[PDB]
Structures are given as C-alpha cells and as structure tokens.
Symmetry: D2
Subunit: 312 residues, 4 copies
Amino acid sequence: LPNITILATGGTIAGVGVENLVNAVPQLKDIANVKGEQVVNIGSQDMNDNVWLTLAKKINTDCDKTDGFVITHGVDTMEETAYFLDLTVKCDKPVVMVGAMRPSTSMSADGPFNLYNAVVTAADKASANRGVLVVMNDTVLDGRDVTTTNTTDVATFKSVNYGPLGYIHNGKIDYQRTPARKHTSDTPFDVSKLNELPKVGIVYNYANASDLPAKALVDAGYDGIVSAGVGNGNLYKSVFDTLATAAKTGTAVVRSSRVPTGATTQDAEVDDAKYGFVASGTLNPQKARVLLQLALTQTKDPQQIQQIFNQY
Amino acid sequence: LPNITILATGGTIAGGGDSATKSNYTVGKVGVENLVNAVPQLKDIANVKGEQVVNIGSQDMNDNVWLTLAKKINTDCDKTDGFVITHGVDTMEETAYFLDLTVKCDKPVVMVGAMRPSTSMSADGPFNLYNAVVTAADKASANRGVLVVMNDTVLDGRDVTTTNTTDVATFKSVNYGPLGYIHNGKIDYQRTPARKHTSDTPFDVSKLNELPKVGIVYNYANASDLPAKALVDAGYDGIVSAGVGNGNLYKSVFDTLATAAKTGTAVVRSSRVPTGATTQDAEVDDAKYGFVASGTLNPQKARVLLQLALTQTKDPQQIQQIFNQY
Amino acid sequence: LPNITILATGGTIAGGGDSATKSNYTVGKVGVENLVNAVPQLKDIANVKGEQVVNIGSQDMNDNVWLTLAKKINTDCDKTDGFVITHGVDTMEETAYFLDLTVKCDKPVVMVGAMRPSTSMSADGPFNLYNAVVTAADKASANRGVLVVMNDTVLDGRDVTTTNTTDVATFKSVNYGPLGYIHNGKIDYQRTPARKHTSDTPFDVSKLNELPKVGIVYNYANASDLPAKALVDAGYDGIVSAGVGNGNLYKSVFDTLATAAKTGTAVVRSSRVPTGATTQDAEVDDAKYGFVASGTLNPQKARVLLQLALTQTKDPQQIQQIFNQY
Amino acid sequence: LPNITILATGGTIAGVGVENLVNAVPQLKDIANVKGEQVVNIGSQDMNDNVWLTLAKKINTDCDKTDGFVITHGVDTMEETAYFLDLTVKCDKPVVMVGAMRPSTSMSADGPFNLYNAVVTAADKASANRGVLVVMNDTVLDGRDVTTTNTTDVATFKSVNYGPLGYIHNGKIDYQRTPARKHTSDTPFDVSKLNELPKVGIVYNYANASDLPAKALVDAGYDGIVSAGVGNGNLYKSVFDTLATAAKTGTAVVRSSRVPTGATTQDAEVDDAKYGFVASGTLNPQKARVLLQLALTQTKDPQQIQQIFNQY
Ligand SMILES: NC(=O)C[C@H](N)C(=O)O
Ligand SMILES: NC(=O)C[C@H](N)C(=O)O
Ligand SMILES: NC(=O)C[C@H](N)C(=O)O
Ligand SMILES: NC(=O)C[C@H](N)C(=O)O
C-alpha cells in the first residue's frame, strides 16, 4: 500500500488537527499508509505568501520520503495555492489539494469522502506527471484551470475552460486529459532560497471606477499590478491611464478579466506592446497574480513576462 | 407596427476593424443609422427611430451616462412604444441593472450588444438587434423589468452577466435563468423576475445630478489593504468587497472595512465567485460590524444597488432590507 | 411546527450497499422510518409522518404508481400541511411533471432523491431530505406547482431534469433555471413557473384506472423504423420522437410516424438534445403531417403530457395547444 | 500556404454545392489552397452507414494528396460521423468537421466564419495527432466527447465531459489538451474492404417503457442493441428482461444513458458480467452505437467488447 503524506493548512474541512481528520476516515487504511503533518490551521481567506513558501519547500524537501501528498485547505483561495504549488513544486510525485464546503458536524458533510478520494488520487500511479491537482466532488482538476464557481455548492470546483482530467468512481480514476501548459519541474521558478515574493496587487474594473486603488499600489512601489478587467480584459479610462503610467515606471502590468471564463487576448481593443502590458490568457486575476509574482523572480521585462504567460 | 426608439451608446455592436478576419477593432466609431441599415428586415417588425446618445466602449461607462439614459427613457416614455439600447458588453450587466431600478416607464426597455465588431465575418450584431426589436415590440415583454437580449435569449437586468471574454453566447442569467427564448421572431416567456424593479422601487433619479461614491475592492491571498484605504481616505460613501468564496475577506481588508463601517461608510460583502449568493449567517457577523450581504448580486451589481440605496439611507439594516427586496 | 407527510417510493435515497466506500448498491431496501431517523434534526422544523407507498428503483417507475401518488395526495390534502416524496433520481423528472399536472392539492408537494446510497460516505440523502422538508413547510413554497429539492436548490417539476449519471449536483432546470436557493433552512424564491400547473390544468386523474399508451423512439444515423412500427402494430395511442437536433427524424422513422398520424395516432416531435425547444416552423411541416412540437419538453416529459392530453382529446391541433399552455 | 480539401456532405451550412461555399468565403485564400469535392448533399438527419464508409475510404485513400480535410456536414448527427471517422480514419493529417445552425441567407449566418475557422484548424500543424476534430463557435473539440447541447444556439457544440482542446482567436489556436483515448491509426478498426456495418439499434428507457421496440430489434437479428438508460444506464424492468435475453442469444448489449453527461459505470446497480452486458462509459447512446458497430467487426465476445469500450 502507498505511503501518503497529508499536509494540513486548515479550512472548513477542519472546522481541528490533522490527527482528528485522518481518524475520522478509518477507510483510509484500505488504500494507503497515511501520515499527517500540521503546517498551519487557517481559513484560506487569510492565505498568504509565507504559507505558500512553507509548502513549496516542505513538499520539495520531503519528496523522497513519501509516495504522494494531500493538502487539506480552505475552499476560498484553493485555486490560488494550487497554481502556486503547480508552478514551484519539483517533486514528480502526486500533489493533491482537497477541501470541503460543509463542516464535519453538518448534515451530509462532504469532507470525509472528499478526503477519501484525494487519497485515492494521490495513491494512483497514473496521477503522476499531471501537475498539482485539486480533487473535489469525484473529479480530478488541474491546478492551473481549476476555480471555485459557486459560493455554497459542493460541486463548486471546476476547470471552467479546458475541463477536468478525469472522474473518480469506486476508488478508481479514468484519466482522459493532462494539462499541456508547462508545470512543476518543467518551470524555471525555484523558490527554495526565497523568503518573500514580489508585491503584486489586483484592482477591479467596473463603470465609473476610481483610479485610487491602482494609484495606491503604484505609490507603494508594487512590483506588479493585475487588472481584473471588464470583458476581454478592458480597463475603465482612469484605471487605464494610471496603469499606462505604471507600466513604464517599474510596475509590471497584467491585463486579466473579472469574467469567469475565457482568455484575455492580445489584438483586441488594447495595444499591449505600445503600453508595455501583458495579456493574462485564461488566467483569472488571482491566478495571474500567482504567475506574475513568479515571473518577477526571473525578470522585470514586459516582453519576457508575456512569454512566461504564454508558456505556463 | 409599433414605434421603437433605439438609444445608441456605442459598444462593439458599433465597432469596426480594418479586416473582417482580424480580431483588432475600435469601438464607438459607427453611428446608429449604419446599424439600423445593416438589418434590412427591421421594417417588417417596427417603425424604428435611432438617437445617438453617446458613442463609447462600455469599458468607459459611468454614472453620468446612466443618469442621462434613465431620465431620457422616463421623459420620452409617451413618444414611443418601446426602447432598445445598443451598448457595449463589458458593463452591460451594470447599466441594465441600474436602469432596471430607475426606469419608471411601463414600456419595454431592451438592451443589446454584440461580441464581434460590425465589420467582422458572421457578425452577431445584426440578428441580435433584430431580436431586441422583436422583444421591445412584444406586448408580453411588458412588466418584466429592464431586459437584455443576446444570442436568441431574453434576460432580466438583475441576474444577467457576461460569462466569457469572446463567446457570442456569453450573456447568461447564471443564478435564476432566462425569461424567454426567441425563435422565428416570437417569444415563449416562462419567467419573470420576482425582485422588485422599475415603478415598484423607491429610487427616483429624475432630479439627481450625481450618484454616491462607491468603489470595489478585490480579495485574494496576501491582499493589500491599500485599495480599501485609498477609498476610505477619499471619503467614499460606500465600498463593495469582492470577497473570496462566500463573501470572505483577507484579514487586513476586513480590518480597514470594519473601521470604515463604524465611521458610517456603507460596506457590502459580495463575492468574486461567479455564481451563488453572498449569504448572511456564515463566517462574518454582519450585524456585529455593520456590514451588508449582497445576495446573488456580484460586486459590480451590488455597487449599482448600494449607490441607489445611499440616495435613500445610510443605515446599514435599511441597506440590508433594500438588498433583500431589490 | 407544520405537519409534513413523507410518501416514500424507494430510490437510492433508500439504497444500501455492503460498504460505505464501494459503489455497488441495491435500491428499495430501506424503509421511510430509517430515513427519517437518519436526519435527527427534522424535529426542529416539522412534525414528520412517513408512509411507504412502494419501495422501488425509479428505473421501474410506471403509470400505476403515478395514479396512486396523485390520488393519494389529492385525497389526503386536508390531513397535512405539505408533502415530501422520496424517490429515485432516474425518472424523478417524469414523476415530478406528472404530479405537476395532476395534483389539485394547494399545499407544497416536494420530491427528493439522493445520488449516493444511504450507506455511503458523505451520503447526500440526509441533508437533501432536511431541505425538502424546509421547502415543504415554507408558506412561500405554495402555488409554484410540484417541486424537486436537491443539492440546496428548489426546482420546478416541468423544467427539472438529471444532467449527470453520478454527480450529487445533477438536478437542474436546464432551460429556465431554479425557483430558489436554500441556505440555513431559508429560501430566496425569485421565480415561479409561468406554464399552467396543478389546479389550473384540465387533467383529472381521480377516477382513472390506467393512462393512454405512449412510447418513445430514438433517432440517430441509419435509424431502424422497427421500433416505431412495433409501437404502431401494438395500437399505441401516442408516440414521442426523440429527434436529432431541432426535433428532426431519420427518413424511415419519419415515414412510419406520418402514416401512423393519418390513422389517428398522436405523434409528438421532441429531441434527444438536452436543452432547447423542439420548435414549430423549422424543417418539419407539422400541420401537413398532423404532428405536434414538444417545445422545451424532452422526450420523457412530452410523453407525460401527451398521455394526459390523450385523456382529453385526440385532435392534433388541440394536443398542440395543450403543449403550448402546460 | 497549406493545401486543404473540403469534402461536402450537406447540412444547413449549405441550405448548394461545395463550389458556392468555398466562393462565399474569399478570405479562405489568405490561409490555404482550398479544393472542394461533393460526397453527398443531405440533411444529416438522414446520415447513414454508406456515407460513413464513403468518407472513411476517401480520406484514407486521398491522405497523401493534401495537407488536411474539412467536412461540411449537418449539425444533427455531426457528433456521430465525427466519432466514426475518429475511429476509422488512418490519415495522420487533420480532419476537421464543421456545420452551421443558421442558413447562408439568414441574419448573422454562422456558416462563413465557422468554415474560415475549420480551415484555420485543418491548416495548423499543431492540430495533427489529436484525432478527428469538430470546430464550431471558435472552439476545437475532439470527436469522441463532442455533442450538440442545444436545439438552436450557435454555441451548441461542446465537449461536455472532458472539455475542448483549444480556442481559436484571430486565426490562431492555443491548444492545451489532446484526447487520451486511442483514435485514428491507433485503432484496430479497418473499414477499407467493408461495404456494410453490423446492424445496431438504440432503445429508450423511461417510466412504463414498452419492451416492443427492443423485441423488434432482437426479432430482426440485430448484431447489437444500445440502451439509452435512465440515470447511470439503468433499464426499465420489461426492457431489462428483453435485453438480458438478447445478450446470451447473439445480440451484443451496450448500456448507455439518455442523461447528457457522465459515464455509465460498472459496479452500480447492474451486474454486467452476470448478464453479458457492456457499460458504455461516457459514450452517449448514438456514440456507443458507433463504437459497438465497429467492435462487432472484430468480435462478438462481450468481455472483449467491454475492453474496446475501455480503450477507444
Ligand atoms: N469551505 C471553506 O474552506 C471556506 C473557508 N473560509 C476556507 O476557505 O478556509
Ligand atoms: N463586445 C463588446 O461590446 C466589448 C466592448 N469593449 C464594449 O463593451 O463596448
Ligand atoms: N440515484 C438514484 O436514485 C438512482 C436509482 N436507480 C433510482 O432512480 O431509484
Ligand atoms: N443545422 C443543421 O445542419 C441541421 C440540419 N438538419 C442538418 O443536420 O443537416
């Protein structure tokens, strides 16, 4: 039976230490030797760069000691941690993230079977070499495209652009897809010696939007700003003016969208070359922030940033 | 054949590029007359009249165009049988809801856009506008609030949003579904919004020169509190949170918003999550902090309503009650 | 606390397997009392009473269970404040619509199922049933027709269907959306079905011992006409076509159905396509052949209505008019 | 510029010969040398085995004469032809199917740009080795999973289980996925010498369903029957009884579902080994019919049929 390490970070799946959780699902012993370590115990709305860094290091450092990783984490920023670990983890062994929408004590709590199926996925050899995974609602989702789609539904997690990698039925996975975008040990991002990441903020666009949020980030010397644009990554005029000024001033600018699916493209309404802006593609704003932070460890150059956004 | 007024505002529907097959295009360049004349069949369903109100990309929509549209619709109500408003897609969901809460005209107001410019191959704008006219002319379209018609579908202004960056099918009422489907110039209406709209709302914009100041702040891991603070220092009347999950906030964003709320800033919790209500009675004690839960309203839509709530009242429990009725 | 009657019929909600973590299970084995007692919190919201009506997999649902449910609900109307019906998922969409057209009780009838057996880990049945009771007890649930409650969502019997073979989230009203969302035992209703239901329909099953014979035939490339013919030779009163695309038929299926229609068999065009109306005025001249277009009704749902239409009339244009009002 | 062959079969995209169509889109000359041949001119509701066979042969025979194939076809059975060609085509060069929901003369007709983008996809070298494709509404969809989802919407075609392969913007495709299931020249199906296919019918399940359709197919000596089950491929009792009898009597039986997504699984309510039935997986009934017809050219054995359903 495979050796599987659970790294606990909190969330509503624990709404409680790694011990209790493991012990709540005695059927885990049917599929793996499960060992639990507590990294943190927080609601994922308070997820931060330091936790990210703790996790990337710990997985990379403990890779040879285990056959796989499950990370119990909150729902709220799961999609952001999944893609961070997707781009920084060097281990070629499965890393599977899982949470829950209802707590342990609620009617029809989703946590137990979620965990069961996260382990089935971490323990399956066919799960290797597909990047960092999220396993929720009987489904295996790549860490790049996965996002939460509904505020309360157990079925919230979806790969809303390119679809899931496979479905889990009766402790078995039929994989039919793997992400093409370069991930894990095919990426230049090496975070083993870093104690902090470049400062990247997100600003929202909408009608009559103020430029003040964007200005406060420029004023604070932020390394990057991600625009959550309207439509195909468009920007309200005040916001566009402030970011056209930040881009040439040592603040990288990534155009993403608040629209929940589809790529922000080049060649639409925004002359990106002319402003020194980067189009995020299908990366949603919080996702773009992950990749922007990590592109800034390698380079401050807009054109080389765009290339990274085109490859990872 | 009924009398329909097109109030044009721009958008990609009025967009042009130099090639039918390149994606590059510019917005707010083509006038209403060209739109009207690119749909030769409109004569069969209505006596159409265009007026260019502005000509912009909806990325640059703003309170003053809103005030201009509402007062214009309300003033001209008795000169026409219905309105179509051609408009960009990017903030269509915002304008549609603003109008849904402010038009007192009891004739259909139907917005419409296109995802491909008017120059492009298989441009979606021509049949979309045909279909917004059908809808505007249909007696059964009355008393449903303000509408958006795109891709053969009639959608209510409250729930409607854009779901994809390029897809002609982008416009969907993602929580409660469409009102009716359009086929052969006819509509099968199976729904009407329950929430109060139009002449059932207390909001009266007829003498308003401006709208209260409301900003939107985003939540994510390691979120800066600087955007929230910039809005607070500027004396904003309201702030909407685009929370994570069920309307949750990063600690530092939370702290800045709680303080603001004690000084009398209206603070609404919404969500960056694209479907589902930001609910009361979850991880935030709203009554403790003086916050308001947005319900199914996404952040840009909560802003519309919060701005309008702030013209009536500054009391958090009254703003809550408004966000439960409208 | 209101009085709620559970009428149990089986389903996976009443399903059991030998392991919590294997997928193998058997249906119609566990009685209503076990269901009720697996939701210890039901005492807080209603005085629940169970009656086992049958105990089957809904794969084996049939006209006689339909007639039994409708007459039972209609007879007992004044003994209770509402009904929950626990039922399999597989044909829930069919039973729900049959009831939606036949119940004359003006108290909520709410069906409910589960996608995992009651034995399984994180079984969905317990909270689903909790939530069908909330809904059945809610005054605002009245006058909406017959309902299905699953995965925190209240759905109308007409549009509701199962969209995935295993997903707990399978139940969706795919054309017109849900009626309301359930959170913390409360509902925000934003819609009601427009189509006529319950005490507004002419269908009266109270003295009926059986239902007219209606079969469903599938279309695909190279389709055999033998299924259509087997139904015609057996003297079926109606045949529903699960057409390709917008309700289109393979030539040989078409030919068999046209003939049947001239001899007085009712023939309804529906579609195997999972959303969108089978429309009039497309590639089939319905008036020419004496066929009826199903609208948004999928084939199994057109069957429900066709069977009921056939108790009133055999005239194709009257069957059309029924499929446009109900 | 690549050489691209358009094979015309009809449909509403031509609602008209291959000549007119090509000529309707003069911008085709920007991306390819386009040559058109007329195979048939029918509404795809009348698609049949003979057309399928004509197409598989013609593509396989003309492979070395061109750089790619676009097939203009009706919407109604596009998904069935795509998977047939997916499993029989031996050419390693792109085969792209396209149709339209509105005719040439309608407001905002979708045909012209649909065709434009089908050619962009047939002409792109990155499109090779992904199987038979369907390109509709700016999207590239694998032929196995693609299905029509709405009766009238231009956006009807979707890969509703595993998602699309890529999106087309400004004449370029960002591919992020490829089907894992074996296709084209990785399949044993060889149709070069066949003038007919095994007789396979489809029966529908629902409440109070008659066994007569199923019996009429057994009585006619059909090689296979596909059940469009309820839920996870369940069968009404009368239908179950008739098919339990056909399965041991020289009529292969495949359990599929009328439910528009998800796999029909083994290990649920139906003891498949015991009845000699095959679970279709994610193959919907009309799709299962394609694979069932072609599995019957190799074998009549239920257990070896199931294996093929597990691999292609
Ligand atoms: N269900 C959850 O996990 C929500 C919680 N706020 C978290 O993200 O930690
Ligand atoms: N499709 C569109 O109309 C997008 C455009 N930027 C607008 O909103 O004006
Ligand atoms: N999930 C379920 O309930 C499926 C079961 N076969 C039924 O419909 O009874
Ligand atoms: N739009 C279409 O292509 C429908 C037509 N009946 C066909 O499949 O040939």
